[PDB]
Subunit: 88 residues, 3 copies
């Protein structure tokens, strides 16, 4: 049921922000890639759009802590989500 | 018709930002809950997506003013809107 | 055909941020307007959502250079995008 799946992808995206605030940047990246992959297979653009919103919030959190490396990492996942969004 | 409701909810979403700018955070919270309720009963996904965009702008405005209690209130309503978007 | 056009407008919204970053505000404004117009004619609400996301990124960039005029210009383009989105 794709609606249970939408809820699952939404929760993963929110945890991306939570983990950026914690400095667990690689884990947040992992969660965002799994949102992208799962959303591109099941063709759900709105899950990707929400992911992009949340990725912007994670950039906020990392800038606030002056972590440029984490910002780079998050921004790579951002560009990937933008490509996948365009194709959906 | 449903176009009228979509524009109305967009209007309320913009006012949330203006109210946040003027320090009227309780009122902005109230308008934001209203947007969630109406879009949720009309199944308007993009209405909530737009509201989320505007809630981020309201957080920007309250950070500029160093109003962290306001930021908390807005983020509480943001969490609620995110929840509704998952179910939509 | 739909995916080709959606992809072109994704790239245009990205080039908006590029041109803001390189300090070409006028050029970003005009590209943003062209995106709104084409998106509107074609009924492409998701393209306008993505454009709004990128215009907020353009604001981020311009406030980073402390360029208040450019910000005002980009934010009125944002207001145009928000209205068109309301009617889509
Ligand atoms: Ni922002």
């Amino acid at each position: 049921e794709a609606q249970k799946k939408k809820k699952e992808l939404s929760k993963k995206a929110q945890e991306v922000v939570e983990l950026a605030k914690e400095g667990k940047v690689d884990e947040a990246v992992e969660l965002g890639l799994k949102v992208i992959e799962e959303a591109t297979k099941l063709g759900l653009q709105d899950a990707v759009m929400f992911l992009l919103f949340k990725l912007h919030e994670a950039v906020h959190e990392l800038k606030k802590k002056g972590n440029e490396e984490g910002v780079k990492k998050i921004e790579e996942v951002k560009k990937k989500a933008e490509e996948a969004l365009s194709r959906l």
